[PDB]
Design a protein. Structure first.
Length: 233
C-alpha cells in the first residue's frame, strides 16, 4: 500500500459525531488538521446541538490514529495509514466503571482531500447524576499508552486500554476501552507486530467562542518495536 504517502504533509480533518446517551441526543462537528510527520493533531470541536450532555474529555478517544508518527524503522507496522484512502471502521466499547458504557462505530477515510472521521455513538445505563451525565470530570486528559495488536482473523488490529479521567473530588473514573479496526476496501493492509501508541493532549477553550466546544492539541507516536543495529543497514 502507498497510503502513507497521503500523510507526508498537513492534511485537513473533518470529524462528525452523532450521539445518544441515555436518550440525551447531541451532535459534534470538529475541524482542523493532522501532521503525521510530527504526530500532531490540532482540532476544534463544537457541539452543534447546544449543550454537550457528557464531559468533553470522555469523547476524546472517540473523536484518527492514521496521524500517529510511526518511527522510520516501524513504518511497516502502521495499519492505519495502510488502509487509506479507502479507510477503516473503528468500533469501541467504552465501559465507565460503576457507570454506563459507550458503543461507537466510526468510519475513518478520505473524502476528497480531507481525512474524515464520522462516528455514531450510543451510551446506555448511565447514572443521571454519575460523573458523566453529572459533569464531574476535570477538563484535561492524562498522557496514556495504548497497546496495539494484530487481528489477523479480521485483517485488522485490536486494542484494549484504560483511560483514567480525573474526577473533581480527586478520585479517578476508569474508562475501559475495547477497540477493533477493520479495513473498508480490499487492498493490502499492514498487519503489525505488537506495539503501542503514546498519546499526549492539551485541552483548551477559544475565548471568542460561545458555543460549547473543545480546542484540542494532541500528539501520537508509535513505540515498542524492539529495534537492533541490523536495521542500521
Amino acid at each position: 500500500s502507498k497510503g502513507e504517502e497521503l500523510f507526508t504533509g498537513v492534511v485537513p480533518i473533518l470529524v462528525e459525531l452523532d450521539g445518544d446517551v441515555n436518550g440525551h441526543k447531541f451532535s459534534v462537528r470538529g475541524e482542523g488538521e493532522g501532521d503525521a510527520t510530527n504526530g500532531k493533531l490540532t482540532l476544534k470541536f463544537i457541539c452543534t446541538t447546544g449543550k454537550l450532555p457528557v464531559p468533553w474529555p470522555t469523547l476524546v478517544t472517540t473523536l484518527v490514529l492514521c496521524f500517529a508518527r510511526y518511527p522510520d524503522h516501524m513504518k511497516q507496522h502502521d495499519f492505519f495509514k495502510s488502509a487509506m484512502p479507502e479507510g477503516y471502521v473503528q468500533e469501541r466499547t467504552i465501559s465507565f466503571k460503576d457507570d454506563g458504557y459507550y458503543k461507537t462505530r466510526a468510519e475513518v477515510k478520505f473524502e476528497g482531500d480531507t481525512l474524515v472521521n464520522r462516528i455514531e455513538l450510543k451510551g446506555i445505563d448511565f447514572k443521571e447524576d454519575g460523573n458523566i451525565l453529572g459533569h464531574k470530570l476535570e477538563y484535561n486528559f492524562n498522557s496514556h499508552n495504548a497497546y496495539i495488536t494484530a487481528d489477523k482473523q479480521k485483517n485488522g488490529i485490536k486494542s484494549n486500554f484504560k483511560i483514567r479521567h480525573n474526577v473533581e473530588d480527586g478520585s479517578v473514573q476508569l474508562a475501559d476501552h475495547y477497540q477493533q479496526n477493520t479495513p473498508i476496501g480490499d487492498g493490502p493492509v499492514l498487519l503489525p507486530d505488537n506495539h503501542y501508541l503514546s498519546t499526549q493532549g492539551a485541552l483548551s477553550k477559544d475565548p471568542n467562542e460561545k458555543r460549547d466546544h473543545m480546542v484540542l492539541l494532541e500528539f501520537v507516536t508509535a513505540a515498542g518495536i524492539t529495534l537492533g543495529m541490523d536495521e542500521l543497514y
